[PDB]
Design a protein around this nucleic acid. Sequence first.
RNA 1: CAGGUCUCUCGUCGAA
RNA 2: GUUCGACGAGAGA
Length: 463
Amino acid sequence: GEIEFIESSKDAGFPVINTPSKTKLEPSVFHQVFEGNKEPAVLRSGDPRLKANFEEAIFSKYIGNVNTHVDEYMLEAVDHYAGQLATLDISTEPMKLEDAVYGTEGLEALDLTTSAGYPYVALGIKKRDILSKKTKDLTKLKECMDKYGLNLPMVTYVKDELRSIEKVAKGKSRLIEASSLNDSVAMRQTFGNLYKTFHLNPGVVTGSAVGCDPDLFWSKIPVMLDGHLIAFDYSGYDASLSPVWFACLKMILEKLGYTHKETNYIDYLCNSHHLYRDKHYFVRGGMPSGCSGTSIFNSMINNIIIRTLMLKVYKGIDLDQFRMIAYGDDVIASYPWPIDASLLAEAGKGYGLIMTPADKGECFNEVTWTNVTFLKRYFRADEQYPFLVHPVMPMKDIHESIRWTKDPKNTQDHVRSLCLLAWHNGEHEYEEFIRKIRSVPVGRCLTLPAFSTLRRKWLDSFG
RNA sequence: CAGGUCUCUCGUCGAA
RNA sequence: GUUCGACGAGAGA
Ligand SMILES: [Mg+2]
């Protein structure tokens, strides 16, 4: 991913965008009860906490592009993954407009809670001014799409979230790319059935975890990944993708039955157009996180990428024994014979990908069921029923969440949600967590689920 | 007044 | 207590 050109939005016939400068995150009543290393991400150039240039920091992810062609490794990779997806019977027929907007099995309706993007954001128009779930009206929508058309610039916002102290100082905040309502709809029309099929089939045939429920899915993963484990991290995956990977995606979509008309949509992903504050800029390469389908297309590409690197590095290898599950850039995999991830990373580098040891380790170590994570969660066999596996989110990450709030009105819901994450750590850890919550006046006012209840509900989930 | 795509889950409500 | 629907929150990518 690379920024090709920047101009003033005025020059390009676009208004300056009002972009929020202040966090919603405030310290909670629990801020001093627990330890934590994270604060709200820098959102503006005049943050007291900066030790670096902010705008320089947030755009540094566009590391550049490699200019290479779709080589023989990619081709075989695409053919192999296309071979799996053919079993699923993905329809390339457009999704009915009502389903695409207001939801159908395997595909939830648009989010009317979120901004409608350009041009609406500068017209003072909201998604709910245009759509309504109670009524399912398409009238007003078709009119806005005919009026403003397709391929609108995406609007860049800084993501309001917790980040480590280090990333605060270095101004390393994350960016999101708001997709225009029109383009979201158009995307969902064209690729909705693929979206649905993926959401209905998390596992090793889609090669995707999108649509999984970790409480249930974790027990299935070791059965599907029965070989020697493969795992590693990427740095700035999305922004690091060079156009050649998008060429790969277009090719696999074609093998699924898609027409050049439809794979043309990917061109507007790869070669994208953005508004940030008062600037209009064009990016070549990079998945613009926030466009419709970012999760699924990122996962599909991840599936191409890993196969490619395997075939490049181990010439001769049999992919039919290979298994992988991606969520965007997050990946867990297995092969019956050992694989040196550090070599895959070196091949990665040549393709413009930055691959590091899993979970920010500093050497590419053996990946074990003991130390492998996925969706920030460890794997732990139940002591009683060893075929059931606990998704174990680190108490320290749970601690980071509880120390902040965007609205103390939500304290009950917030803490209860964390309890459903925490209990998988064990009765002892849970109770300690419950105690510290009760060690403070607001804590003693909350209704908190008992361990035994959580365990019972979970066990019941498998019946 | 402004802050994406999505998945899962919890909670409140409410219809047969 | 199921299934379904609308709202809010949390987490993950
Ligand atoms: Mg990972």
